[PDB]
Amino acid sequence: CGIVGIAGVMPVNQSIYDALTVLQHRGQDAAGIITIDANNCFRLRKANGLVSDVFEARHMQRLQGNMGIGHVRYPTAGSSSASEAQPFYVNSPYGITLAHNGNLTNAHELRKKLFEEKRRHINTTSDSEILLNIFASELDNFRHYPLEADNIFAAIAATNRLIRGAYACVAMIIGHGMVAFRDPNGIRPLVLGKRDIDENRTEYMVASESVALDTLGFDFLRDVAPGEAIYITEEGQLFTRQCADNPVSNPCLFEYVYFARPDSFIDKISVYSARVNMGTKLGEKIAREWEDLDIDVVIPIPETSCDIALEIARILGKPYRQGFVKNRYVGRTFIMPGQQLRRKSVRRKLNANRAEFRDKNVLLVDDSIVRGTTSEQIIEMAREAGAKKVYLASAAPEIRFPNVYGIDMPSATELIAHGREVDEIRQIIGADGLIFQDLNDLIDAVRAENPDIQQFECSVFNGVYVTKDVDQGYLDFLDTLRNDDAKAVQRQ
Amino acid sequence: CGIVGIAGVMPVNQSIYDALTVLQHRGQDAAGIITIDANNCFRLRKANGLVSDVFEARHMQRLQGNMGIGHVRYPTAGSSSASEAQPFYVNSPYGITLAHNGNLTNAHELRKKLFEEKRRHINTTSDSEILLNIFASELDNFRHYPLEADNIFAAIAATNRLIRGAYACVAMIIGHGMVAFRDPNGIRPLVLGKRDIDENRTEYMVASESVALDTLGFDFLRDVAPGEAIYITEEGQLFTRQCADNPVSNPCLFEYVYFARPDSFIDKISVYSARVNMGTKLGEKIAREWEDLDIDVVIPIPETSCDIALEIARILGKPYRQGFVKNRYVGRTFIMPGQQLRRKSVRRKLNANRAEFRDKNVLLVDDSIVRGTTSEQIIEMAREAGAKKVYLASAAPEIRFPNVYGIDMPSATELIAHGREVDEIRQIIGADGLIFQDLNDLIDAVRAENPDIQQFECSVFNGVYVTKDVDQGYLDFLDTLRNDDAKAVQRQNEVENLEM
Amino acid sequence: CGIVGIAGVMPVNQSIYDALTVLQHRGQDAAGIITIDANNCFRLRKANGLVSDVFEARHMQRLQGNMGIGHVRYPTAGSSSASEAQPFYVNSPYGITLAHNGNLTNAHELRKKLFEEKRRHINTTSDSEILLNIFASELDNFRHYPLEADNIFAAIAATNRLIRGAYACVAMIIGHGMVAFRDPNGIRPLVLGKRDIDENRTEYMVASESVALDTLGFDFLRDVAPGEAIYITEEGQLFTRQCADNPVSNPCLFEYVYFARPDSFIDKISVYSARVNMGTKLGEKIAREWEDLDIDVVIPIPETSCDIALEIARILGKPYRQGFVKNRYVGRTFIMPGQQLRRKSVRRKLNANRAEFRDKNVLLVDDSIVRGTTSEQIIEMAREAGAKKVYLASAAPEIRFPNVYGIDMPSATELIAHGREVDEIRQIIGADGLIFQDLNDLIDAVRAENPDIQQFECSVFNGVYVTKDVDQGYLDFLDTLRNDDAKAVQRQNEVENLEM
Amino acid sequence: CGIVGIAGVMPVNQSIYDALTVLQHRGQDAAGIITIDANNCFRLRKANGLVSDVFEARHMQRLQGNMGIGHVRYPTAGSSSASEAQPFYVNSPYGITLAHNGNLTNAHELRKKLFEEKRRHINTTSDSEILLNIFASELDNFRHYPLEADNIFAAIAATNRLIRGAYACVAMIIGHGMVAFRDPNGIRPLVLGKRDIDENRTEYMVASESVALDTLGFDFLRDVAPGEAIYITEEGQLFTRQCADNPVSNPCLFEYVYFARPDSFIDKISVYSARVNMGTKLGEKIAREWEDLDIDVVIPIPETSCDIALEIARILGKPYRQGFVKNRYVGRTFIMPGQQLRRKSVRRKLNANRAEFRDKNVLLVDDSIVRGTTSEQIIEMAREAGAKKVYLASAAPEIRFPNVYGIDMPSATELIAHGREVDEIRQIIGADGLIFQDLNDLIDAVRAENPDIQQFECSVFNGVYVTKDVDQGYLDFLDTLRNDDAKAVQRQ
Ligand SMILES: O=S(=O)(O)CCN1CCN(CCS(=O)(=O)O)CC1
Ligand SMILES: O=S(=O)(O)CCN1CCN(CCS(=O)(=O)O)CC1
Ligand SMILES: *CC(=O)CC[C@H](N)C(=O)O
């Protein structure tokens, strides 16, 4: 998911909409924008679909005000495509809205405590609604009005002591302003920027990625530190405060592999440069372990891997060729009467340039392997196009464990690498050869850009969850959620 | 514009819809699909928007039948977003529908003749409706039923003697089959493919590009020859015939530069290879002519120039780096009362990776320069991202003339290269250096993929029009069509706003 | 179905739209409006739904011009909700559009002739498209431009010799004007009105009913005579001509019973007065025949019978009371998995005021009895609301035959009165008593308003068809059309459900 | 506005939808349905438009559960067509939703107290949102779980002591059930019904009018008494409790004139019979004050007046004729480019049967006169149709004062009878004669059906507001609200 918040000195509706169109790759299932108007009331529009489809002229006219936040959703366990999207809202205390990218590992316990100690009802199964209600509950411990920046930071700190997981959040409190805060491990991405309108007026904004600041002409300031919170009043006054104990930087390594945009700088690291480095590492590993193989050309599987594969071909002294063309426009399959509903294809998303595989031993490069379904079909397409030997290299290491910090992954059972060695995975997908990036190499590829990061969040790769609260029981719990989300989406 | 026609043995709606999705890059303004159902009647669904938005389940349900044609629209003079989309239709003789990618240079005269001689009314300003009416009138000359293949070819031949310009068409005649034909100069693209089902049951298909055959699992057979017509009966039989007097192969060179998909083979030429060859040529030209220049990096302006720039970087022995990222998703700019700090037009399209320009003499590579407006903006974006020297190389030679064969290009006075030297253009766009592909190089780059083609359609580059009927009176008439088109689009916006 | 045509001197879109809203009671299935713009081209917007839903601002913007026609559809055999709505169109000769309320009894044969002789394809199963094609073919017989009024009338006359059945039509011919014409037997309704603007600048209009002229402030001139045609040129000139061999006035008697609006004057007969007269006749019949019965109150089954029942209550010297209220708003019944306790079909339509039936012998009055299903349900509703005796009186005589002139009625075997005595029908519907209007009384009731009409169209009542071409082969063919129509509507529902 | 609530033993979505289609005349601007699902979560759909347009198959599929409430909105001051419709919702305590027909005369003060004492934010300008928040606030004073019926009644009683005005309300509290309650003056309508499914299962429902019970096959039980509250648990157990001091019956007299359906029985009075009685009274007044006038026929102005006029013609021994036909289908007027936007007409809503006015002195009957605009045009139409003398009789007395109890009326300035005598009103609308029903006659017409009612709510007629808290200051306050609603709707 992706979030954006803008505390401006002029209408923000178009700007939030614009920031969301460049963060669209973070989620295309739903979008939402909520602003505070001249009357200190929230105006909201959120619905399923791409940003460009969710917000029509009439909704834009309603989104009045100089402060607002937005969200684009990537369906996850608990937040199915059929469920209410973000931002979520509460009317007490004061009126609070919040958008979130992440996941709370203790959501269920929090929901119990909210119900039993505060009588606060959670209407969805989204941990973002629960996150909003914990914060609201903490803000409700104040008598004096209005709240000082100290009370808002105190509430966020109290919140950080209750919730556990990963989270990049942005919220607005009526009559106060905008807050943004990050988990104590710095797992989910969040940057801060500003835009000077004149000598006395400066607008602020926070976004999941720096590209949202670039597209609007905002100057990059810095990443919001782990555990840090940012508060911008109504009036445009900026406050920042460390709101967690023992904060450390463990950025999600997955964002760098393919999730984030290449033009973003996350925690001082260029995603693009980190990706070129991955190709450098993978190229060196291939040149070492596959010295005797006959490889005629390196062909990336679009689109993230094109640069990675380019670097590999350079290292290997082999030609790089566009063997696969990604279909920019993909349509749906219709359930028609009498007609046989045939095949779920990768051919809908990808086309093979026939001339580029014919009688060649091809090294295909992909960003990662999850279910293994697509790679299987892609290798098949290479053979149909006349390829002799088909090898596959993965920019990311084996993905064996589920992500519980915000990135959507299927259950451990549906992960081809889970419980399997490289050769078996290779035989299943039917490749002549399979090679994965070493985790320590991925780490160095990214770390080389910012050596200050000591450790990243690498759970999908090594099964080590930094929050130390993940076990099979919890993962099974998450699966039951997916089962309920399925029944709901199936229904629609 | 892109066209597709499938004569199958099983339901074609999903397949036509899928073929259009991979031809979607030829026009995103409107889309249309028409089929012949089991009762020998047309079923149609066409409207503005992408294929994925135009056709919903309720529309697909009505598009029944085993034969059908499709079209995606790129708006051009005489066919604005506001006007009626293709495919077009007429009910006599027989019931005929047609889809066309191209442009008739004698549309006006044809419309007058149609009115005076046949009393056939043309409801839109689209020459594609006129083409259909000439075809329909020629088919009305037979007095025996059903028509024989020879009759249908005779009609296409009569049509070709009457019409002038460029065209790739696919049509359907109720009770007979699907026909496809191409102009006598092979200007517009059109290929034929097949899919065997069993002994003497093959499905046939025609499309603007081979990627449409690929995606549906059809075996590519060959390009429809210039002036040739193909005819596939409802019973699945194939017939073809040369329907032009002196057919020549003069493929539009523009398709190769950026309009078609790189994974397509147009007249035996791989679009991808041709573009790689375009990089080899432009890189050697730069090596020769810009030898004294220090360029630190080669940066493509996405998306067409990525491989071209890679090749250029390879010839120059300079690094290739992704400096610009094209925003895959662009939204609408709503006209709100007092839009305070508007987001820059260029930023809507692209985003610069600051790190890739800082303190660097950069060489940018774009597919072409038309108006020159966005070029000046991209150059500015690079200096803003920290570049020192900003050079611009264009994979296409100077674009100085309007295209009247189906590719939408502004008028001659709107083209920045028109009436200007390279150094004048350079000054206007603000580059430290500007270099264009030489036309003969572009020609060799594409021809290298198939030496049989000796002459390409180059009018936008050299002002030479093969139909030899392009004069100022005609150009001016096209400008008139464009102005009326604009009025119709402006009106449509007027109360879309007032309705609020 | 209802039609409207306005030949004005200022924009007609809003006016046509308003005229259809007051003709909306003649069909709520679909609606269509087409105009001729300043460039002599048609602009059209037609779709399923009420007028208020079909035409939005963006559609009205495109419907430019000072002349246009409109149509609202009631679905009938050959024209299901699924099929294409009116008005229909053809591009040759000239560009002709037409809207029709009625039915051609020789549609099949006409379609065959059109195919064989003219190679004119009919895309739908609507005889209105066929009618347009016969008209179009007759207009293709002239070799001088423009056509003279006399030519256009000659074509309508040729058409009338070819077609059989009932029809009220309004059409437009590009470059000439708007025409309107009525069948030789004056079966379907059609009136002419005008609106003066200044010296020699009058706007003309035709519509199915006079309430459409009223609402737009047009001066009612007169009914279009049977077999007559009206022609209004673009320049505002009026011409008329008798285009039938032996025109007779045989107005559909059904329009009077309940189909038309009470504030309309059809062939000099006020619909309202005729219905009041229908009450006078039925009340005197009841007084004479049900003299020994104790009836406490007269209760109409809304909405057509309110004034009829009032009149009946007046003749019987019994109180009139609103026992049933018709639910102005009816919703959709969604097909949900396991719809536990479904709301009764009759309750969706009506609601009973419990107080008005309790311990009372009630006399209910309905406009007619077709299938008899809803009648049995209303009777049940009354007993449930506490009635003791429940008698039913029908303003229309027994409905025993199908209508093939434009009014949608089920087949003969589906009509409860078909092959049954009044007492048998009574037993089936469960009334304590049942009484029908006598046909000669219904006739006198309407004729009293204009003694000049000596014969009405009564086929649904007496099986006598004026066109004398209605046999079982034809009836069976209509049943075939209805079945195919049902399949098309069923299919449309199938994935509307599956899409969920 | 109209409300409905159904506590059933099987899905209620279609039934609530159906009940709302027969209460559609109470408001056509927006509709909303909210149900509690098998998971104890609310599922909601509300939007502008008729019920048949607001609820599509997909929304119906989402509205799962055996308990739910609905609302159809009639735009009023504070709740413009552009504002969020009902039912409103709050997440604490427990989760509460509420639909309301009425108006709180002390809304502004309540909103201040809610903000200052509870930090509860009101996002709309609707007093129904404020009503919901007062109730929620009162329900929040409980420690033990779940709430007993006594606590729910205590909260409603505490609520009745704070709010003032008129209100017929229905709400649902998650994990508890459905509540319905009426103001202490019995101004707004509300009935209770039941449906026996079997020996052990009985469903309950409440609606603004009895027609909603009839259409669903529910048996009428009784009107909910003034100040009374009804509570139905989840489990189908019914509780009732008087929750106000000094409750009295002052039903809104206006509902009977034209607002309610004729087939409804409100407070034991048949609306239909009360209307026939109005014609009896008005007929007697005309026969007495207009003895010497030449009247040829009585013509009602559709549709409510047809019966009233029928009774008048009977009393007067004059013929009743359908001179006016109401156009059942009315369309909109389009703002087109270049075209002159002409006339706002009554001809769009009404057609004159020409033959029925020609050379006659006509007595037109209408249900009431507010702005006087339409009557003016109607009389004009009668003259155009050839009428000689045109007289007008109003079933209701002069409407001189604004209604602040739920019925939408324009400000006192826009009421033709405000500050004007009959003759002046007559000259303005251009009638040859004008006669209004006497208030005491209207009272007797309605009261004759149920003599137990001593006094009705008659404010629009006499300017006496039973809640004793209405003065010019307040009425001016209401006008500023209309001005803000206007700017909002104008905007859309
Ligand atoms: O943004 S807008 O105001 O336009 C739409 C508001 N949005 C509609 C959908 N519901 C959840 C439906 S249900 O889960 O309760 O059925 C959340 C609120
Ligand atoms: O904030 S604003 O005033 O701009 C919009 C108010 N908003 C409109 C949409 N509904 C839910 C739609 S549905 O869930 O009922 O479909 C919630 C209220
Ligand atoms: C409603 C009507 O008059 C039907 C017209 C014609 N028969 C048709 O199109 O079906």
PDB file of N, CA and C and ligand atoms in Angstrom, chain A residues 44-47 59 62 82-84 123, chain D residues 42-44 62-63, ligand 1:
ATOM      1  N   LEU A  44     -14.570  13.088   2.226  1.00  0.00           N
ATOM      2  CA  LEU A  44     -13.955  11.837   1.790  1.00  0.00           C
ATOM      3  C   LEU A  44     -14.496  11.192   0.534  1.00  0.00           C
ATOM      4  N   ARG A  45     -13.591  10.542  -0.190  1.00  0.00           N
ATOM      5  CA  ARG A  45     -13.893   9.744  -1.378  1.00  0.00           C
ATOM      6  C   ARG A  45     -12.881   8.611  -1.387  1.00  0.00           C
ATOM      7  N   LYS A  46     -13.380   7.386  -1.347  1.00  0.00           N
ATOM      8  CA  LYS A  46     -12.549   6.181  -1.401  1.00  0.00           C
ATOM      9  C   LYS A  46     -13.407   5.105  -2.056  1.00  0.00           C
ATOM     10  N   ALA A  47     -12.787   4.258  -2.868  1.00  0.00           N
ATOM     11  CA  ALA A  47     -13.515   3.205  -3.575  1.00  0.00           C
ATOM     12  C   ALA A  47     -12.503   2.310  -4.266  1.00  0.00           C
ATOM     13  N   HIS A  59     -16.261  14.295  -7.235  1.00  0.00           N
ATOM     14  CA  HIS A  59     -15.641  13.944  -5.957  1.00  0.00           C
ATOM     15  C   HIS A  59     -14.554  14.994  -5.650  1.00  0.00           C
ATOM     16  N   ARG A  62     -15.787  18.143  -4.089  1.00  0.00           N
ATOM     17  CA  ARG A  62     -16.128  17.939  -2.688  1.00  0.00           C
ATOM     18  C   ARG A  62     -14.906  17.905  -1.770  1.00  0.00           C
ATOM     19  N   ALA A  82     -12.959  -6.733  -1.301  1.00  0.00           N
ATOM     20  CA  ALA A  82     -14.371  -6.484  -1.022  1.00  0.00           C
ATOM     21  C   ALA A  82     -14.595  -5.606   0.202  1.00  0.00           C
ATOM     22  N   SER A  83     -13.583  -5.508   1.048  1.00  0.00           N
ATOM     23  CA  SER A  83     -13.674  -4.741   2.285  1.00  0.00           C
ATOM     24  C   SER A  83     -13.445  -3.226   2.139  1.00  0.00           C
ATOM     25  N   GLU A  84     -13.915  -2.486   3.148  1.00  0.00           N
ATOM     26  CA  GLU A  84     -13.788  -1.033   3.165  1.00  0.00           C
ATOM     27  C   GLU A  84     -12.304  -0.653   3.079  1.00  0.00           C
ATOM     28  N   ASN A 123     -15.124  -2.371  12.699  1.00  0.00           N
ATOM     29  CA  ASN A 123     -16.071  -2.877  11.703  1.00  0.00           C
ATOM     30  C   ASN A 123     -15.472  -3.707  10.567  1.00  0.00           C
TER      31      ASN A 123
ATOM     32  N   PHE D  42     -21.571  -3.901  10.789  1.00  0.00           N
ATOM     33  CA  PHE D  42     -22.562  -3.211   9.983  1.00  0.00           C
ATOM     34  C   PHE D  42     -22.128  -3.269   8.514  1.00  0.00           C
ATOM     35  N   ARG D  43     -23.112  -3.415   7.636  1.00  0.00           N
ATOM     36  CA  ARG D  43     -22.911  -3.401   6.192  1.00  0.00           C
ATOM     37  C   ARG D  43     -23.848  -2.253   5.790  1.00  0.00           C
ATOM     38  N   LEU D  44     -23.313  -1.283   5.059  1.00  0.00           N
ATOM     39  CA  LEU D  44     -24.079  -0.104   4.664  1.00  0.00           C
ATOM     40  C   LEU D  44     -24.031   0.306   3.210  1.00  0.00           C
ATOM     41  N   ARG D  62     -24.227  -7.352  -0.349  1.00  0.00           N
ATOM     42  CA  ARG D  62     -23.424  -6.929   0.790  1.00  0.00           C
ATOM     43  C   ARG D  62     -24.249  -6.706   2.058  1.00  0.00           C
ATOM     44  N   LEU D  63     -25.520  -6.372   1.897  1.00  0.00           N
ATOM     45  CA  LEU D  63     -26.359  -6.101   3.052  1.00  0.00           C
ATOM     46  C   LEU D  63     -26.867  -7.384   3.702  1.00  0.00           C
TER      47      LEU D  63
HETATM   48  O1  LIG E   1     -15.831   7.478  -0.544  1.00  0.00           O
HETATM   49  S1  LIG E   1     -17.266   7.523  -0.701  1.00  0.00           S
HETATM   50  O2  LIG E   1     -17.900   8.330   0.318  1.00  0.00           O
HETATM   51  O3  LIG E   1     -17.678   7.879  -2.042  1.00  0.00           O
HETATM   52  C1  LIG E   1     -17.846   5.817  -0.404  1.00  0.00           C
HETATM   53  C2  LIG E   1     -17.831   5.502   1.106  1.00  0.00           C
HETATM   54  N1  LIG E   1     -17.544   4.027   1.415  1.00  0.00           N
HETATM   55  C3  LIG E   1     -18.488   3.149   0.708  1.00  0.00           C
HETATM   56  C4  LIG E   1     -18.331   1.688   1.116  1.00  0.00           C
HETATM   57  N2  LIG E   1     -18.452   1.516   2.569  1.00  0.00           N
HETATM   58  C5  LIG E   1     -18.286   0.053   2.967  1.00  0.00           C
HETATM   59  C6  LIG E   1     -19.464  -0.797   2.450  1.00  0.00           C
HETATM   60  S2  LIG E   1     -19.944  -2.167   3.590  1.00  0.00           S
HETATM   61  O4  LIG E   1     -18.746  -2.955   3.814  1.00  0.00           O
HETATM   62  O5  LIG E   1     -20.424  -1.536   4.807  1.00  0.00           O
HETATM   63  O6  LIG E   1     -20.978  -2.909   2.886  1.00  0.00           O
HETATM   64  C7  LIG E   1     -17.437   2.341   3.211  1.00  0.00           C
HETATM   65  C8  LIG E   1     -17.644   3.792   2.869  1.00  0.00           C
END
